[PDB]
Amino acid sequence: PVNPCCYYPCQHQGICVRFGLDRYQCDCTRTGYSGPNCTIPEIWTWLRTTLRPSPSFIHFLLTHGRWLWDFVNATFIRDTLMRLVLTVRSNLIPSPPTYNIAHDYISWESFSNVSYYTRILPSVPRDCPTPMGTKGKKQLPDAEFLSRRFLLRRKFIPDPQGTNLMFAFFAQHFTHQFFKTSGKMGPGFTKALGHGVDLGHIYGDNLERQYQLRLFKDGKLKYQMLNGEVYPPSVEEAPVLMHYPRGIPPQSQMAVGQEVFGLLPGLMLYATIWLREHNRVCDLLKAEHPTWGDEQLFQTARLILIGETIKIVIEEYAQQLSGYFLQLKFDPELLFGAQFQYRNRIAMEFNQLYHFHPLMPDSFRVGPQDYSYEQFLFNTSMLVDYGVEALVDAFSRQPAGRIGGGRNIDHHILHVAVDVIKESRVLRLQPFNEYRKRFGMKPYTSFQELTGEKEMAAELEELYGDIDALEFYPGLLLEKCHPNSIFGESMIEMGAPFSLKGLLGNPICSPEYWKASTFGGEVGFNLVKTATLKKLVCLNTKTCPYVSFHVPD
Amino acid sequence: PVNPCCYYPCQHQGICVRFGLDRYQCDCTRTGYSGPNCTIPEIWTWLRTTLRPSPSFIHFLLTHGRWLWDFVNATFIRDTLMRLVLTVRSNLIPSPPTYNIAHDYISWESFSNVSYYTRILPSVPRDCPTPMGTKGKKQLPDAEFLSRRFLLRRKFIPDPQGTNLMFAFFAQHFTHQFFKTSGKMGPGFTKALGHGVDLGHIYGDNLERQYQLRLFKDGKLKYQMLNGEVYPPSVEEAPVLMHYPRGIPPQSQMAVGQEVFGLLPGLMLYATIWLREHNRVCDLLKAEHPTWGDEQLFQTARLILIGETIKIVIEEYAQQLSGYFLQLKFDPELLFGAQFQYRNRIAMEFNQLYHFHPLMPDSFRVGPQDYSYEQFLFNTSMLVDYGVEALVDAFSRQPAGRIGGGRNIDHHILHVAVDVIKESRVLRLQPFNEYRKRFGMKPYTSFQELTGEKEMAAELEELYGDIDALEFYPGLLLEKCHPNSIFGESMIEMGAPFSLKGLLGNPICSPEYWKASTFGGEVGFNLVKTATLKKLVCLNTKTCPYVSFHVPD
Numbered sequence A, B: 001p002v003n004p005c006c007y008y009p010c011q012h013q014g015i016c017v018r019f020g021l022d023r024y025q026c027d028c029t030r031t032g033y034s035g036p037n038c039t040i041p042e043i044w045t046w047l048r049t050t051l052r053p054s055p056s057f058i059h060f061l062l063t064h065g066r067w068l069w070d071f072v073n074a075t076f077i078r079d080t081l082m083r084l085v086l087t088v089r090s091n092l093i094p095s096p097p098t099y100n101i102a103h104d105y106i107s108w109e110s111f112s113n114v115s116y117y118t119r120i121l122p123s124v125p126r127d128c129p130t131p132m133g134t135k136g137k138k139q140l141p142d143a144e145f146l147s148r149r150f151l152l153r154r155k156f157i158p159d160p161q162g163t164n165l166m167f168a169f170f171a172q173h174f175t176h177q178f179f180k181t182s183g184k185m186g187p188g189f190t191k192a193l194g195h196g197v198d199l200g201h202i203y204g205d206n207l208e209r210q211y212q213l214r215l216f217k218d219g220k221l222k223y224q225m226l227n228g229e230v231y232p233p234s235v236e237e238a239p240v241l242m243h244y245p246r247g248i249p250p251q252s253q254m255a256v257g258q259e260v261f262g263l264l265p266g267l268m269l270y271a272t273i274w275l276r277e278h279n280r281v282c283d284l285l286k287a288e289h290p291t292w293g294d295e296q297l298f299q300t301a302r303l304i305l306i307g308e309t310i311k312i313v314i315e316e317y318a319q320q321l322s323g324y325f326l327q328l329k330f331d332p333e334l335l336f337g338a339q340f341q342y343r344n345r346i347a348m349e350f351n352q353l354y355h356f357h358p359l360m361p362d363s364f365r366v367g368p369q370d371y372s373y374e375q376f377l378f379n380t381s382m383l384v385d386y387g388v389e390a391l392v393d394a395f396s397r398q399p400a401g402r403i404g405g406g407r408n409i410d411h412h413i414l415h416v417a418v419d420v421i422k423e424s425r426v427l428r429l430q431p432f433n434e435y436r437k438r439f440g441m442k443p444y445t446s447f448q449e450l451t452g453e454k455e456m457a458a459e460l461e462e463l464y465g466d467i468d469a470l471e472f473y474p475g476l477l478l479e480k481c482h483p484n485s486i487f488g489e490s491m492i493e494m495g496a497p498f499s500l501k502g503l504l505g506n507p508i509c510s511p512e513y514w515k516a517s518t519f520g521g522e523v524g525f526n527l528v529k530t531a532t533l534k535k536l537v538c539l540n541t542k543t544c545p546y547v548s549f550h551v552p553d
Ligand SMILES: *[C@@H]1O[C@H](CO)[C@@H](O[C@@H]2O[C@H](CO)[C@@H](O[C@@H]3O[C@H](CO[C@@H]4O[C@H](CO)[C@@H](O)[C@H](O)[C@@H]4O)[C@@H](O)[C@H](O)[C@@H]3O)[C@H](O)[C@H]2NC(C)=O)[C@H](O)[C@H]1NC(C)=O
Pocket: A113, A114, A115, A116, A184, A185, A186, A189, B206, B207, B208, B211, B212
């Protein structure tokens, strides 16, 4: 017979489970609903759901009250929302975590085997009619086609929000500390254990690699003076296993902590900046605490970077992206009264979703110059030629591409996009609509409703055959993005809960760690409480260039 | 100069930290106190501490109101206390965890390197005058001496509480799933990652070993019919790496999951019982869910054992030990409204403390027989000779030894005790009094006050030289135990917070997992909600023998 859970009968997070040979049961426990399929609101949840506004409307508010917001922003009405935005958002992420590439059910292995990435929704039963479930054509769209047909850039549609490459790279850099798939174990697994903001894209993702990177003196990290300026050490002085092209492995071949940070000046640039900082903070610490050994002058140094990072990501990175008028704010105490699990676990769906590849331009302008991908990718001399300062002032000026709308992934990288959908299929992630539900939204009723226009809409229908079988990565990118937004609705509604759940789920964010001692002295704490993007740079440089997550003017 | 943190100036969990060359600062953040050394209660904490009764008195209540308790026990006044006993107790355990053998400060490594055991109090600064801190003789008592002088059994003083060996073994068995030190990395480290009740003393502590133990069919574990009865499989059919003596490795040499469970009939016995059960539950599951594969019919099976175990430990194991009249109760929902981190981490201090070796008798009586250690230890034929039933009915009758008072560790095992203090010294655990404080008690003012008598008291003084330099393991065992208690005050006051913190900190105990689906169907849940000791046995046997954590009559 037909595996009954192939219809995804259970609603509102109700657990589906086969009983007997052809029967099934929903586990609406705390679902907030009662009944066979979890579709009977309890008195309260019914109130909640009736007095509950459209996610589309709440967005409207967050982006319109120039005045109401300038005022809510200068009063406590600020922390109250921030504290609200947090709790509510991250409450949609299961914690402890639930499934993986190998388990569509609760399990101890899933719980303890860090090796796995995790999922929010189970997978599409391997024995279901359609590869998506029950609806659609028994053959998903020719992956490579879709990619060129709808995601392939034509004319560069830039981010209406003012985003720039200075942001794009940070995004990339940052996201790699937790997103690290291995061809070894394959899709659905991850090298970057720890999951989250641990800077294991700096200090490396294993103890050894760290050590092989640490200068084991005054708690700093090795490095080298090239032109007077500081830079990461070369693999000739640090045996860290990199991925550079069989070229001049000795010099110019730097060791960073993130195996791939050599394939792009941006990622190396940043890797540099942070490293610059790290040692920079060591200098600071060692003064307040001379007696301090190497390890302490290292652990404390690290943590201060987890602070500054988690800090910048929310109050500036997230800010720019969101476009909200409400001043996002990083303050662990906002949850000290809430029920929250201080632990995160990267999710495959989060992974796929964070693919902002369309942010990347056509070419990379650096002042009067104008490097092509070919001359940019794997390039080397560029970082140490131009110098941090000037090379930042360059990305802080060249605009980023719009993530939403569709058709904006440059052809060079366009290959990625295809492997995402290919992998998405590997993993067996349920359909867009199925994920729209779990993140508090309604399923799109028609392809037309999904995209502002009618062209792609129809063409897409004569492919998947039903809005209900649309895929995850395609729908996210192909969704009519918000008015003047950098990307569609579903992007933030699905993105936020993952991002914050893990952004604040970091141990340092808990009451147990959030103390001045955890950063040895006030200086440490105040560094985490004062981190700026403009500071991460200008404090570790010779000169202060223009720097921001958005183009000037 | 003198490392200022050698006096342990900071009070109530205040973090001590060197500033400059000879200065220090206390971090009373949320200490509940303000000031230089954290000794100024805030309005509230001052109320709390004044309206706060003696721990010695609360014990008095929990052990006296025959009537008041029979009534509090039959009403909600029960869950309210149980829910109170939990929260309050486990609030004394840092979570996320704090230090290790290598870090006397907060650190990311400490956070993520599961390899480490963790500590509550930092260590005794390696550069302090006395090896204990500031007070005492610069030479700790000759370890081996103490052991024979005060802990070495003379006349067998049995547990006044009625405890039996049926309990003693469970205690041992159970505790080894999280206590597994390696000579490899050495003291302060642990093989048993996962920390806590994961039954990694059954399913093994690594994926491989599990697999090599799993019969990969109908989700059961391999086994062998010896005399009609089921038993663990031999290493001849399961390559699991054991520790048996170079004898008859083929037969009689069983594989269990806990490398050492062969060195004692009790531990093997239990290993058997549980295994019997596991498969037993598989049979049950597979009926409710035939479609279910191997992995599911295994993970679900496991979890049901984590339930039944966590269950029995609290409502029966803990019960007997405590001696309270309040009916301890296992119900995860009692914390669903509290702020609690669903994660535990074994602590070196917890380790040392759980050494109830004095529970072990002089000899082991099995009916009219009466085996000597020599003929009991590493014995083999015994388990399969007598049979579970009869061999349980034997331990459920022979009394256990009193853990407290002092002088009760049989000579054969008496060697252990010496390595505990030796290791305690290896680790550099602060003095008893220092630990008495952190667990809400007052430091003993004199050696005399510590032990009911005056003999040991004085003799102990002309050794350590000050009650303030007394050690951890010695003080715990040498403390005047409560009136008719199985052990002293400090034992429960320090034991409980660790035991529950981790007993309920198990992922299954959280709202996210605590659902009937996590055990596939109600049957699973009701198994966890109904686990008895009398059932773990009699349900997996031919006959129902006498079984309990205390001797009959
Ligand atoms: C998290 O989970 C992943 C995935 O399970 C772990 O990685 C994977 O680990 C397993 C077991 O180590 C690997 O399985 C393979 O199994 C074959 C078959 O074994 C053979 O058949 C039986 C086994 O029951 C025996 O009779 C034979 O002697 C023999 O063992 C084996 O041949 C392979 O060598 C291998 O062990 C799997 O290859 C491995 N890789 C992945 C990603 O799938 C991962 O370790 C775990 N993480 C942790 C830390 O626990």
